[PDB]
Amino acid sequence: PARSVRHIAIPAHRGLITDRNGEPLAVSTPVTTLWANPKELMTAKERWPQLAAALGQDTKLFADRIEQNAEREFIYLVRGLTPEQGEGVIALKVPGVYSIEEFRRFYPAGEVVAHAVGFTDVDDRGREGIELAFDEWLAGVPGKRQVLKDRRGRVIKDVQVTKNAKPGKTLALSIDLRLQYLAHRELRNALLENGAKAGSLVIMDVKTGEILAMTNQPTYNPNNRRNLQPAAMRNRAMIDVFEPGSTVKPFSMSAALASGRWKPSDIVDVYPGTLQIGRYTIRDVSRNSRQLDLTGILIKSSNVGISKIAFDIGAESIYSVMQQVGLGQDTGLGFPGERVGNLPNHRKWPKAETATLAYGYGLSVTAIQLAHAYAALANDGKSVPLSMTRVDRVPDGVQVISPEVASTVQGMLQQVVEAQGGVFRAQVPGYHAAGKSGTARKVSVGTKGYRENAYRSLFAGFAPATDPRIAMVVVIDEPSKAGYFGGLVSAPVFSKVMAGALRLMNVPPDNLPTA
Numbered sequence: 001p002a003r004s005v006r007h008i009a010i011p012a013h014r015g016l017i018t019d020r021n022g023e024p025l026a027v028s029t030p031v032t033t034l035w036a037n038p039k040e041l042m043t044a045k046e047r048w049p050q051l052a053a054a055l056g057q058d059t060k061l062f063a064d065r066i067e068q069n070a071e072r073e074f075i076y077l078v079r080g081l082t083p084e085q086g087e088g089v090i091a092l093k094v095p096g097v098y099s100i101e102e103f104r105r106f107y108p109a110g111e112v113v114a115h116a117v118g119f120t121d122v123d124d125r126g127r128e129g130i131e132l133a134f135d136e137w138l139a140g141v142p143g144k145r146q147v148l149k150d151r152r153g154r155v156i157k158d159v160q161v162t163k164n165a166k167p168g169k170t171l172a173l174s175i176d177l178r179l180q181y182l183a184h185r186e187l188r189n190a191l192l193e194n195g196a197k198a199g200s201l202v203i204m205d206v207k208t209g210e211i212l213a214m215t216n217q218p219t220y221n222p223n224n225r226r227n228l229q230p231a232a233m234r235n236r237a238m239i240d241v242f243e244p245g246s247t248v249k250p251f252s253m254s255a256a257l258a259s260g261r262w263k264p265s266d267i268v269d270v271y272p273g274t275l276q277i278g279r280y281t282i283r284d285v286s287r288n289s290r291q292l293d294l295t296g297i298l299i300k301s302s303n304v305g306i307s308k309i310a311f312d313i314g315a316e317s318i319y320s321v322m323q324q325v326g327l328g329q330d331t332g333l334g335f336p337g338e339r340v341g342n343l344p345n346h347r348k349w350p351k352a353e354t355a356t357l358a359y360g361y362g363l364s365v366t367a368i369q370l371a372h373a374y375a376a377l378a379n380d381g382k383s384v385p386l387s388m389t390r391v392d393r394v395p396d397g398v399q400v401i402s403p404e405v406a407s408t409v410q411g412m413l414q415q416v417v418e419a420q421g422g423v424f425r426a427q428v429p430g431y432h433a434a435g436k437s438g439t440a441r442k443v444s445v446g447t448k449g450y451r452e453n454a455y456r457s458l459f460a461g462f463a464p465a466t467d468p469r470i471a472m473v474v475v476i477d478e479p480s481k482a483g484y485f486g487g488l489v490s491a492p493v494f495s496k497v498m499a500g501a502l503r504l505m506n507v508p509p510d511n512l513p514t515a
């Protein structure tokens with residue numbers, strides 16, 4: 001054809017992502033992509049070697065590429081150069097060489113918030129994290145332009161633009177970059193000090209359902225598009241499931257207190273520190289107890305104690321609490337590839353499965369689910385929907401644990417942290433803090449039993465105890481030093497991060513004299 005009217009795409013500006021206070025976290029940056037029409041290049045061959053050198057290409061390999069693409073009318077030279085580098089090639093004035101203005105993401109906080117903010121692909125589309133989850137909101141709509149193409153791929157004139165490029169929309173996350181940096185720094189330090197393989201830390205606002213911080217190790221710099229390490233790009237807090245172990249005992253206890261059959265001052269006989277159930281043996285770490293009260297069962301973390309309570313009240317009541325607080329349940333966050341985990345269910349619960357459920361084996365949850373469950377407990381038993389975006393109007397929560405039961409369990413968890421023989425490393429000077437340690441043996445990758453030397457160290461809690469504001473989970477995978485108990489490995493991280501986060505949020509210190 002002598003003339004040919006066709007259409008080309010004009011890239012649109014991707015929406016700005018900020019933290020909850022407007023600090024930029026993902027910013028669309030103008031880049032210059034160079035393309036060429038090989039047929040037009042065929043008329044200026046003496047210019048090719050200088051063009052090749054400017055592109056850092058070998059002269060022969062470049063010439064070979066153009067010659068073998070002589071039939072085509074569109075060939076990429078280089079994508080995503082800075083407009084500074086792009087003009088240096090444009091300045092050669094080579095016939096048939098053209099530029100289009102595209103966009104590439106810059107991430108000002110880099111590795112500090114990489115998992116939460118996420119990453120974009122070669123075409124500026126979200127492929128991880130918020131970038132992926134809110135891709136429709138962020139992407140906008142590209143422009144569509146008219147053209148006039150010949151048999152040589154030549155363009156004549158303009159006088160067009162049928163469709164204008166629509167920019168994407170701004171998005172403010174629930175994340176507070178101040179708390180995010182604190183959490184990042186403390187988790188990294190903990191990983192290194194313990195020679196651990198991986199870790200996750202989530203901070204949630206118990207009143208609004210907002211995720212205030214979400215950090216994992218290992219992490220990566222999303223501005224380095226060359227490294228491409230899949231393991232480091234995993235948002236473990238949302239995609240890696242684990243047995244939460246003794247961190248679910250406060251939920252078993254909630255079921256016990258709701259049953260009508262148990263009060264905190266009631267007693268369980270846990271002597272001699274083991275309990276046989278068919279071919280399975282329930283075992284406590286500390287085996288020098290006889291009568292323990294319900295608070296003591298949580299302080300000492302007696303598997304025997306919680307198991308006997310579970311046999312009394314029935315597994316159904318415990319399953320119900322865990323399901324209602326969201327363990328093994330869809331979070332509704334809508335991140336593709338987010339893992340839901342699994343909460344086992346039965347019509348007739350056998351005794352072994354009843355016991356293991358009560359102390360957190362045989363179910364799999366994510367760190368986000370665990371933090372959300374603790375948020376409901378801290379928020380006087382009311383569960384506010386999870387959000388990764390800033391919440392200005394809070395949706396109504398669902399009452400999942402009665403307020404009196406939740407309050408009672410809160411006081412028990414304060415004792416876990418403060419009482420003699422408790423998790424003293426979770427204490428937060430100036431405040432009352434509450435929570436529960438866990439230590440879980442990892443199930444072998446093959447068939448293959450439980451891995452003898454591989455543990456996960458957990459601490460989950462909230463503060464300030466007298467008026468809860470923040471819930472936090474710290475999960476550290478395979479610590480390598482002498483300590484591996486959650487109370488040794490994860491509790492000090494909870495303490496350090498809570499100390500900073502409460503003060504960054506201007507929460508009044510509550511360890512005061514009696515009124």
Ligand SMILES: *C(=O)[C@@H](NC(=O)[C@H](N)c1ccc(O)cc1)[C@@H]1N[C@@H](C(=O)O)C(C)(C)S1
Nearest residue numbers: 245246285301437438439440441485486487
């Ligand atoms: C819950 O997390 C419980 N953990 C275990 O019973 C676990 N199978 C285990 C026992 C012994 C080990 O050396 C390692 C793992 C109890 N709660 C824990 C906690 O951290 O609070 C323990 C006190 C380790 S036991």
